[PDB]
Design a protein around this ligand. Structure first.
Ligand code: U3P
Length: 125
């Protein structure tokens, strides 16, 4: 099989199946099930609770600078339901542990391809 950059973005950052984090253990479960903690704990990761179509649409919205200075980033006009997963103080690989926090923010993504879709999650603002 093959995984594209766009598909990896979906695996790492999309969860359209819920309107918001579904439990206090959501991040522990998702960071594991989406294979985001294989070799080390990832300190922060955001999941977006919106339709794929609505997130892909961001690539036709507000062009902004990525934090690294690249100019292929785009900010959403809409405010989106997101979950931020962040390591707790006691998290220690291979037993990675996360606090699940709900938010409603704009997202900033990097985009590529035809169709022109997200390949990178840059920030929420
Ligand atoms: O609000 C944020 C900021 C960063 N990241 C993620 O944290 C990592 C380092 O910045 C990135 O993961 P990556 O290298 O696989 O693309 C980025 O997507 C988030 O998930 N949410």
């Amino acid at each position: 099989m093959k995984e594209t950059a766009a598909a990896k973005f979906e695996r790492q950052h999309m969860d359209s199946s819920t309107s918001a984090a579904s439990s206090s253990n959501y991040c522990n479960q998702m960071m594991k099930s989406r294979n985001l903690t294989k070799d080390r704990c990832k300190p922060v990761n955001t999941f977006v609770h919106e339709s794929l179509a609505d997130v892909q649409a961001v690539c036709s919205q507000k062009n902004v600078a990525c934090k690294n200075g690249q100019t292929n980033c785009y900010q959403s006009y809409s405010t989106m339901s997101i979950t931020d997963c962040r390591e707790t103080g006691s998290s220690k690989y291979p037993n990675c542990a996360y606090k699940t926090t709900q938010a409603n923010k704009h997202i900033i993504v990097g985009c590529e391809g035809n169709p022109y879709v997200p390949v990178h999650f840059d920030a929420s603002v």
